[PDB]
Amino acid sequence: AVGIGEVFLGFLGAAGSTMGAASNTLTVQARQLLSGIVHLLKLGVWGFKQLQARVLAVERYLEVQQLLGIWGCSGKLICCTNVPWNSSWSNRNLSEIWDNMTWLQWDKEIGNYTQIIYGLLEESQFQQEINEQDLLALD
Amino acid sequence: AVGIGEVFLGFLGAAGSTMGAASNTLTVQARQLLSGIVHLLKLGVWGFKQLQARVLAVERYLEVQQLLGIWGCSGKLICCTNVPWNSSWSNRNLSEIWDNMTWLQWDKEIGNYTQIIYGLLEESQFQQEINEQDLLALD
Amino acid sequence: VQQLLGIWGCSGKLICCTNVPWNSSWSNRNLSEIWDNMTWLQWDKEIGNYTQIIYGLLEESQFQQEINEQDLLALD
Amino acid sequence: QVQLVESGGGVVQPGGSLRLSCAASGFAFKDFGMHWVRQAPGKGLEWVAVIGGGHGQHQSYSESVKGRFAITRDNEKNKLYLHMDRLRTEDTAVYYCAKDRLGRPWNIGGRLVYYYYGMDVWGQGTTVTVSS
Amino acid sequence: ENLWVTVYYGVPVWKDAETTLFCASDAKAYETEKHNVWATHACVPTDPNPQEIHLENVTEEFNMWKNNMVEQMHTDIISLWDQSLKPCVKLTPLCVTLQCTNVTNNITDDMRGELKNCSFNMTTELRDKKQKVYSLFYRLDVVQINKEYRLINCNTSACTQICPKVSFEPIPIHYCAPAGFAILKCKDKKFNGTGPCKNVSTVQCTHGIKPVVSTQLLLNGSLAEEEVMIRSENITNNAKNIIVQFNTPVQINCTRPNNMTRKSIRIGPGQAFYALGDIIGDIRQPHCTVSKATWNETLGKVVKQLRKHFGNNTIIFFANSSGGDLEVTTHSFNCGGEFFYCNTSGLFNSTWISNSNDSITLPCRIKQIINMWQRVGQCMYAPPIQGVIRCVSNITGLILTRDGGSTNSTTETFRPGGGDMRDNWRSELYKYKVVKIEPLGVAPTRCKRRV
Amino acid sequence: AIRMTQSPSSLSASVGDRVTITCQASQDIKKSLNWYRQKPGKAPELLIHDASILQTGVPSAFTASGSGTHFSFVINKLQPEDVGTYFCQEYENLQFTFGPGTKVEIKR
Ligand SMILES: *[C@@H]1O[C@H](CO)[C@@H](O[C@@H]2O[C@H](CO)[C@@H](O[C@@H]3O[C@H](CO[C@H]4O[C@H](CO)[C@@H](O)[C@H](O)[C@@H]4O)[C@@H](O)[C@H](O[C@H]4O[C@H](CO)[C@@H](O)[C@H](O)[C@@H]4O[C@H]4O[C@H](CO)[C@@H](O)[C@H](O)[C@@H]4O)[C@@H]3O)[C@H](O)[C@H]2NC(C)=O)[C@H](O)[C@H]1NC(C)=O
Ligand SMILES: *[C@@H]1O[C@H](CO)[C@@H](O[C@@H]2O[C@H](CO)[C@@H](O[C@@H]3O[C@H](CO[C@H]4O[C@H](CO)[C@@H](O)[C@H](O)[C@@H]4O)[C@@H](O)[C@H](O[C@H]4O[C@H](CO)[C@@H](O)[C@H](O)[C@@H]4O)[C@@H]3O)[C@H](O)[C@H]2NC(C)=O)[C@H](O)[C@H]1NC(C)=O
Ligand SMILES: *[C@@H]1O[C@H](CO)[C@@H](O[C@@H]2O[C@H](CO)[C@@H](O[C@@H]3O[C@H](CO[C@H]4O[C@H](CO)[C@@H](O)[C@H](O)[C@@H]4O)[C@@H](O)[C@H](O[C@H]4O[C@H](CO)[C@@H](O)[C@H](O)[C@@H]4O)[C@@H]3O)[C@H](O)[C@H]2NC(C)=O)[C@H](O)[C@H]1NC(C)=O
Ligand SMILES: *[C@@H]1O[C@H](CO)[C@@H](O[C@@H]2O[C@H](CO)[C@@H](O[C@@H]3O[C@H](CO[C@H]4O[C@H](CO)[C@@H](O)[C@H](O)[C@@H]4O)[C@@H](O)[C@H](O[C@H]4O[C@H](CO)[C@@H](O)[C@H](O)[C@@H]4O)[C@@H]3O)[C@H](O)[C@H]2NC(C)=O)[C@H](O)[C@H]1NC(C)=O
Ligand SMILES: *[C@@H]1O[C@H](CO)[C@@H](O[C@@H]2O[C@H](CO)[C@@H](O[C@@H]3O[C@H](CO)[C@@H](O)[C@H](O)[C@@H]3O)[C@H](O)[C@H]2NC(C)=O)[C@H](O)[C@H]1NC(C)=O
Ligand SMILES: *[C@@H]1O[C@H](CO)[C@@H](O[C@@H]2O[C@H](CO)[C@@H](O[C@@H]3O[C@H](CO)[C@@H](O)[C@H](O)[C@@H]3O)[C@H](O)[C@H]2NC(C)=O)[C@H](O)[C@H]1NC(C)=O
Ligand SMILES: *[C@@H]1O[C@H](CO)[C@@H](O[C@@H]2O[C@H](CO)[C@@H](O)[C@H](O)[C@H]2NC(C)=O)[C@H](O)[C@H]1NC(C)=O
Ligand SMILES: *[C@@H]1O[C@H](CO)[C@@H](O[C@@H]2O[C@H](CO)[C@@H](O)[C@H](O)[C@H]2NC(C)=O)[C@H](O)[C@H]1NC(C)=O
Ligand SMILES: *[C@@H]1O[C@H](CO)[C@@H](O[C@@H]2O[C@H](CO)[C@@H](O)[C@H](O)[C@H]2NC(C)=O)[C@H](O)[C@H]1NC(C)=O
Ligand SMILES: *[C@@H]1O[C@H](CO)[C@@H](O[C@@H]2O[C@H](CO)[C@@H](O)[C@H](O)[C@H]2NC(C)=O)[C@H](O)[C@H]1NC(C)=O
Ligand SMILES: *[C@@H]1O[C@H](CO)[C@@H](O[C@@H]2O[C@H](CO)[C@@H](O)[C@H](O)[C@H]2NC(C)=O)[C@H](O)[C@H]1NC(C)=O
Ligand SMILES: *[C@@H]1O[C@H](CO)[C@@H](O[C@@H]2O[C@H](CO)[C@@H](O)[C@H](O)[C@H]2NC(C)=O)[C@H](O)[C@H]1NC(C)=O
Ligand SMILES: *[C@@H]1O[C@H](CO)[C@@H](O[C@@H]2O[C@H](CO)[C@@H](O)[C@H](O)[C@H]2NC(C)=O)[C@H](O)[C@H]1NC(C)=O
Ligand SMILES: *[C@@H]1O[C@H](CO)[C@@H](O[C@@H]2O[C@H](CO)[C@@H](O)[C@H](O)[C@H]2NC(C)=O)[C@H](O)[C@H]1NC(C)=O
Ligand SMILES: *[C@@H]1O[C@H](CO)[C@@H](O[C@@H]2O[C@H](CO)[C@@H](O)[C@H](O)[C@H]2NC(C)=O)[C@H](O)[C@H]1NC(C)=O
Ligand SMILES: *[C@@H]1O[C@H](CO)[C@@H](O[C@@H]2O[C@H](CO)[C@@H](O)[C@H](O)[C@H]2NC(C)=O)[C@H](O)[C@H]1NC(C)=O
Ligand SMILES: *[C@@H]1O[C@H](CO)[C@@H](O)[C@H](O)[C@H]1NC(C)=O
């Protein structure tokens, strides 16, 4: 017997799900980052505060997109890279991570090496661009 | 004898043109969506209203770009997909659509199925990403 | 700026190659001079007059690339 | 049938101005370009000016009349107007308005282009005369 | 065959929408340096060469009676006037008892009792000193308390004196659409304000619109190109106002011949009240004049256009206003800074049955305490203008109201109307609409994405 | 820019004989030709467009053949209701230059 939920999980519905299963609902979080959960302000303290918040949200979203593009992952929800994984960051095997862990737990585990990984992604993408230019200039 | 217009059509100049011919002037509309048709506000009701409008325009433009990226069509004016066309949406043959119809007429015709098509594009792009990851993990 | 880059087919890239050939009228300096004896400020001063021409050519080339892609791959 | 009637032709001194009006019926006026053609008395036909279909955003004038003639349409009125200004002794002639086989504005490569394929239907004639 | 969805970004598609337009003005206003409200608080430089693109093949539905442009323009003008009045002097101390006598120094019989010489005690730049001063007040701006009078506004609110450095003269204003929106313009000559338009264009900005404030007569506006135009949300409903647009203007010459002197009274530190000091010469009624023949011809054309809706044999009556306050019952306007209210009974006094410089003269009155926008509690004081005032304007249209008629259908009578300035804006914005662009399209092709 | 010449200036032919009019162009147009007929004291008519296709509403009593620079108009049996000024027009450019015209008459 199979019981079925009424509707897809929704915003943050996979926060407690395994990392592998949560990959099926990344779009909802991505949309919320920009538009919120699916009229005119008036001049004043309240309206000014709301406008500031909206501008801040736009800036945050654009910062994330800029980072993705800098890594060569623009326009993608799941992007593969050429950066090898360092067991120092985590030695758990793939099954543990993708079938017995949540993204919150993973963030807690590898929060210390996040900036290192980001820098490595930057360097790899830049080298990829340079090598692309040289290899294809030879053409 | 061939008479020639002074300049390219311009903003919305192809609104009455055939869908095939209108493809040559998509860039002008895309630019207008962000910058308007090709100094400082003062604090007040008027300036606050204008700033709100500008922020709203930025949000609308980013929503459109987010949708395009979610479909796997980022950075493209014309993007091909893997979603087959359903004759239920429209049974007109290609010649009719691309040589005897305008985009306004087409929108009126298929306005009911737009959300269905959007969802199908989302699903196809996500499946493409997943299959890409698996196929290329086999490498 | 990002819209311009995407319109040129160079979205998500810091260095983007194109199909637009270089016109010696814009500058006749050889590659070594430009890339080993010039700065970007000097280069901008030199070729500031032809920038819009180059931008338009990039636009046209990208649009033609999209059209030819669609036709070639519709033949598939 | 496709019928063109021309009017507005009279007598005007040299250096004056005159307006000729052609009323069109039996066909879609907006869908075709129109020509103004002049038959000098006892001479051959000579094309004067042409205006494109639709909004009439294209106008071409003969060098003989360039700089002093102006063509205009009124699709609601189905009227074709020629604004003869700074007339001369040789302008006296019979002026015809004719429907072109084509001339509808077309979008080709993001540009407005008009293809003119001659004259299929002519009016009946309207004579202008300059004297002093 | 096999067809696949294809996505196009930047297609020419639009929907009816509402947004916040911005305003532009020519550099000429910036060269005046008279601090026009529009050019000072709201507007930006106008494009030297505005772009207008004619849309071939396009037919678009317009409705001038559901256009948010009118509402935005009304809100904008009201807000700008209030903003310009914020830093001006508040005439709170002017609400005092006035000892008023007549002004019988060489007046005409028609101007008897219209002006009053009122003496009163007023504050000075020193809080502990009072000055006895006198001024001339129009009969309409004062009311008897019980020779004792008070300003009309004293029991409602305090009036704000218009800063003489601020100019409210109408300069052309262009309304322009922001990113993602377009302004569509109907160029049909006989467009009645509602329905399809087959000659459409898209414009960055509207034409220069002068925000003229007037009642019963549209002044300095746009003219019809072919014939007189009658426009109404529902012509058969007598409760809906009729906007009449002329094809030829009618000249109107309005004048205040009295030579007036402006006197400054210091009512506080840096606070000056500008009163009417004295009248040099005789006192005569301010008046407007229009040619009788031109007005008769215009009324004949209007009647001809009305008979298309009310019958070829119906008798048409032009009668004066029914009732209300001064603003609605009179042709109200601003001439050289002074606020005129003119009696239009001589203009609509005609009968038509479907079968030379007499210079119709309309008597006018002048007011200094002004209630604008049909509001209450925000009265405005207009300082007097020194000298003799003459202005020449063009009547380009009318606002009319039809009586019930009792359903007899034998006769129809039309009276001048107005009050709501939104009709004045509609008289100019009837040909414009705002649309929102939808740049995403999906269509079938033989193109298939790579795997 | 393009000069258009019709030969001969006039023709006198019997009733029921071939009538040929030659049309010469300074520059090649190669498809842009129209053959017009203006009967004496009447408005012109359009007979053939593109130098080879008869206009609808006219019997197949006229033929046209040519290309490049040279064109030719051929008449069937010269019926009495055939006399008229035959004009040779070009529409290759925006000048729509007309020909001088050819006068055709019957034997008398
Ligand atoms: C429909 O449209 C018509 C035409 O567009 C319009 O008529 C115009 O009205 C305006 C305003 O009423 C007129 O402008 C005024 O004209 C007077 C007369 O001066 C004439 O001669 C001078 C000589 O150089 C010319 O420069 C001038 O253009 C006129 O031809 C001027 O005196 C006015 O300027 C004074 O007042 C301005 C506003 O207050 C000041 O900014 C300016 O500096 C001047 O100051 C004077 O007055 C001050 C008090 O107000 C005082 O303190 C100063 O010391 C000084 O004395 C102003 O330019 C214009 O001429 C009219 N045009 C025509 C053709 O008639 C209608 O009014 C309009 N209808 C409606 C309903 O809006
Ligand atoms: C306003 O509305 C009118 C009416 O719909 C539009 O008029 C159409 O305009 C388009 C061009 O914008 C016309 O199409 C063009 O046809 C050319 C030749 O057509 C003839 O030959 C074909 C051969 O199959 C016949 O089927 C047809 O009936 C004609 O006899 C094409 O050459 C044009 O370009 C095509 O070919 C070139 C290569 O030569 C390709 O590069 C192009 O991509 C394209 O495939 C073009 O297709 C159309 O015929 C007109 N219709 C009518 C009824 O007149 C206006 O365009 C529209 N807009 C404006 C501004 O007026
Ligand atoms: C509105 O109401 C106010 C106040 O009621 C009027 O103001 C008054 O105007 C009258 C007439 O101009 C003034 O009376 C006249 O004043 C002249 C100025 O003289 C001043 O100085 C002398 C000497 O110190 C004082 O005695 C005098 O009071 C003034 O302060 C005098 O010269 C006049 O008298 C002489 O001239 C007249 C005319 O030639 C002769 O007939 C006399 O016999 C005498 O030779 C006269 O006294 C009065 O002072 C003003 N009052 C105030 C408070 O200013 C406004 O005129 C009125 N406006 C209207 C439109 O009705
Ligand atoms: C533009 O303006 C005109 C004028 O105002 C409008 O025309 C009016 O339309 C309304 C609504 O259709 C009419 O009122 C209806 O009339 C129907 C016909 O009855 C006639 O005869 C009776 C005799 O007693 C009169 O009472 C009546 O007024 C008509 O003259 C009635 O059958 C209707 O009654 C039903 O509807 C009403 C309203 O819901 C209910 O209360 C009733 O119980 C009943 O169910 C109704 O009275 C009106 O007569 C029209 N006036 C004229 C002068 O023609 C246009 O509609 C308007 N156009 C737009 C687009 O708004
Ligand atoms: C400006 O203020 C002054 C002073 O307040 C006013 O003058 C004053 O007026 C009152 C009323 O008229 C005078 O009182 C009355 O005096 C008469 C005698 O004249 C007496 O019979 C009454 O019973 C009453 O007491 C008062 O004396 C007088 N003061 C002065 C002149 O110094 C003046 O009226 C005010 N001006 C205006 C325009 O209101
Ligand atoms: C509206 O129009 C009516 C009709 O034109 C005006 O009434 C008319 O006014 C004229 C001029 O005052 C009257 O003529 C006068 O008649 C008297 C008496 O015979 C005579 O002494 C005068 O010399 C002059 O000729 C006319 O009789 C009168 N008619 C009626 C029926 O009243 C009316 O004044 C107009 N209203 C306005 C506000 O203009
Ligand atoms: C994985 O990360 C560790 C750091 O935690 C890298 O080890 C470092 O290597 C650099 C370069 O030789 C040394 O300077 C550091 O002292 C090393 N630190 C430690 C803690 O070992 C290691 O090289 C990384 N793995 C790979 C394959 O690059
Ligand atoms: C084209 O769209 C129609 C819907 O309009 C699809 O038909 C539906 O198919 C589902 C799945 O079997 C059924 O539950 C619905 O009842 C069907 N509705 C109708 C109206 O037929 C159809 O399958 C689509 N075509 C393709 C190829 O997927
Ligand atoms: C390089 O640019 C020059 C312009 O500076 C191009 O030369 C122009 O070519 C067009 C098209 O034939 C002519 O209309 C202009 O008159 C030419 N101008 C000059 C100054 O020569 C040249 O064609 C370009 N090179 C290439 C390969 O396209
Ligand atoms: C639509 O209206 C415009 C504006 O009147 C027409 O174009 C104008 O034509 C008249 C006469 O030639 C002149 O005002 C100008 O030449 C044109 N003005 C502009 C701005 O182009 C146009 O012809 C009309 N289209 C129709 C009736 O189909
Ligand atoms: C002062 O002005 C008032 C207001 O006009 C006058 O009051 C009117 O006077 C006339 C003439 O006697 C009467 O017919 C009216 O009945 C009065 N009342 C109204 C409301 O008009 C007053 O007469 C004037 N006094 C002086 C001395 O000029
Ligand atoms: C009132 O209308 C008249 C007539 O339309 C205006 O006078 C004309 O103004 C135009 C402005 O471009 C001139 O070209 C004409 O030469 C003037 N005379 C005529 C007879 O047309 C006058 O300017 C208008 N006044 C206002 C205040 O709008
Ligand atoms: C303005 O014109 C439109 C049509 O162009 C009028 O609308 C029509 O009104 C008649 C009645 O007079 C109806 O029978 C039609 O069905 C209406 N059609 C449309 C498309 O609206 C409109 O009434 C006119 N408004 C006026 C004259 O004020
Ligand atoms: C209005 O009144 C003022 C003041 O009486 C007049 O100004 C005078 O003008 C004359 C010339 O006309 C000068 O000689 C005087 O010196 C002026 N006196 C002043 C300024 O105090 C003005 O002319 C009058 N205006 C009218 C239209 O009558
Ligand atoms: C309104 O005032 C203007 C002047 O500002 C008057 O125009 C004058 O009219 C007379 C008589 O026709 C002419 O002699 C003048 O040459 C005109 N002057 C101009 C045009 O500057 C006009 O007549 C007045 N209208 C009225 C009083 O109804
Ligand atoms: C406007 O002018 C008209 C006529 O010039 C005035 O009409 C008079 O109004 C009074 C007051 O109701 C009536 O008793 C008379 O019958 C009218 N006389 C005439 C000549 O018709 C009217 O009063 C004026 N308007 C106002 C409010 O002053
Ligand atoms: C209209 O005219 C009548 C008759 O002259 C008059 O009684 C009435 O007061 C007038 N109304 C207005 C508003 O002037």
Numbering used by the authors:
A (entry chain A), B (entry chain B): 512 to 549, 564 to 664
C (entry chain F): 589 to 664
D (entry chain H): 1 to 52, 52A, 52B, 53 to 82, 82A, 82B, 82C, 83 to 100, ...
E (entry chain G): 32 to 141, 150 to 185, 189 to 309, 312 to 321, 321A, 322 to 398, 410 to 505
F (entry chain L): 1 to 108
What is written in the article reporting this PDB entry?
To provide insight, here we compare the recognition of naturally elicited and vaccine-elicited antibodies targeting the HIV-1 fusion peptide, which comprises envelope (Env) residues 512–526, with the most common sequence being AVGIGAVFLGFLGAA. Naturally elicited, FP-directed, broadly neutralizing antibodies, VRC34.01, PGT151, and ACS202, assume multiple angles of approach when binding the HIV-1 trimer at the FP site. The naturally elicited antibodies included three human antibodies: PGT151 (isolated from an elite neutralizer infected with a clade C virus; 60% breadth on 208 panel), N123-VRC34.01 (isolated from a donor infected with a clade B virus; 50% breadth), and ACS202 (isolated from an individual infected with a subtype B virus; 26% breadth). Molecular dynamics analysis and cryo-EM structural analysis of the naturally elicited ACS202 antibody in complex with the HIV-1 Env trimer with an alanine 517 to glutamine substitution suggested enhanced binding to result from electrostatic interactions with positively charged antibody residues.
To elucidate the structural mechanism for the improvement of antibody binding to the A517E mutant, we determined a cryo-EM structure of ACS202 Fab in complex with BG505_RnS_7mut_A517E, a prefusion-stabilized Env trimer with the alanine at position 517 mutated to glutamate. We obtained a 3D-reconstruction map at 2.30 Å from 635,332 particles applying C3 symmetry. Local resolution estimation indicated that the antibody bound with substantial flexibility, with Fab having a substantially lower resolution than the Env trimer. However, the antibody–antigen interface was well defined in the density map and showed that ACS202 interacted with the N-terminal segment of FP through β-strand interactions from its third complementarity determining region of heavy chain (CDR H3), similar to that observed for the previously determined ACS202–AMC011 complex. The electron density was relatively weak around residue 517, especially around the glutamate side chain, indicating conformational flexibility. However, residues 517–518 had substantial shifts, with main-chain atoms between the two structures having up to ~4 Å apart. The conformational flexibility around E517 could potentially allow the nearby R100f side chain on CDR H3 to have more favorable interactions with the carbonyl groups of residues 516–517 or to have dynamic charge–charge interactions with the E517 side chain, although the refined cryo-EM structure exhibited a distance of 7.8 Å between the two oppositely charged side chains. Structural constraints from the rest of the trimer–antibody interactions likely limit the interactions between the two side chains.
